[PDB]
């Protein structure tokens, strides 16, 4: 919005601004391992 000018002043032109804000992107990760003996005793009972 602009103000009206008085005597001897340049009337400023109508100003329209278009901007565009981009997105930063950032992944995260998490690792955890399981041992092979943990994997063996995880799924089966060998014998009860």
């Amino acid at each position: 919005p602009r103000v009206a000018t008085g005597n001897d002043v340049t009337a400023p032109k109508e100003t329209t601004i278009m901007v565009a804000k981009h997105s930063e992107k950032h992944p995260i990760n998490i690792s955890f391992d399981l041992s092979a003996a943990c994997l063996e005793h995880l799924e089966n009972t060998f014998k009860n």
């Binding site: 000018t5 008085g6 005597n7 001897d8 002043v9 340049t10 009337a11």
Partner: protein, 282 residues
Amino acid sequence: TVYCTFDHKLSLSDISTLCKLMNIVIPIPAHHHLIGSGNLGLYPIVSSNKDYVHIRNVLRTMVVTILQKVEGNQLVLRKPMTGQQYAIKNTGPFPWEKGDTLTLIPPLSTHSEEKLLKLGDWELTVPLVVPTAIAAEINIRLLCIGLIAVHREYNEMQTIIDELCSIQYRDVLIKLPDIVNDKQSMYSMKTACISLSMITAMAPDIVRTYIDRLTLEDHSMLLIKCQELLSLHATDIKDELKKIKSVLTMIDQINSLTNEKTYFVVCDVSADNRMATCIYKN
């Protein structure tokens, strides 16, 4: 349209004088939709050294408007468009034969004081309108005053100026006093000096022969006056065309020196010759 407002109330004598002064070109530097007392006219520059050529240069830079429809303190100035028809009241002391081109000239200071406006340390300095012939005449005189005043003598500067300055065109005596002798004539003579050197070096063999051949054949009395100032050709014709073209271009350059841009072209003139119509803007 540029509206002028002086912020100061004017009297009935002032509105009568502006009614007398309606339809006159006034230059403004501002280029706004509004102007006031400070930028109207030529007074905001004619306090700086009063040099005629300085006023002439900035008056070339100015933007011209036409007075219209003064409603009291408010003062309309039309910005006149290119080639359209406009009515102008004249101020130059001239008889204004129709159809001539017109330029816009700084006000030659007459001995009588102006009656246009003087209000609160501010006058209405209106530049004059003149025909292009007398405009170029004045510019010749400016360049000539510089050519003489680069040369230095004692009690001869006045002897040149009083003879040269008072000129007459269409039964009108004008004069230009108090030349400061700035270097304005020195530059605008310097390119002339350059171009005259080029006229010397590039002028053909036909032409300075053409004087002597014309005189030795026949004679006329103005040719005898030109003689007072004065005192094989085997197919080089394309070179002659080129040399005459170069000499013509130098004469175009020195003409562009002393020339002033025509600002108006007259069609109809009133019998009183106070107002005239034009179809032009640059």
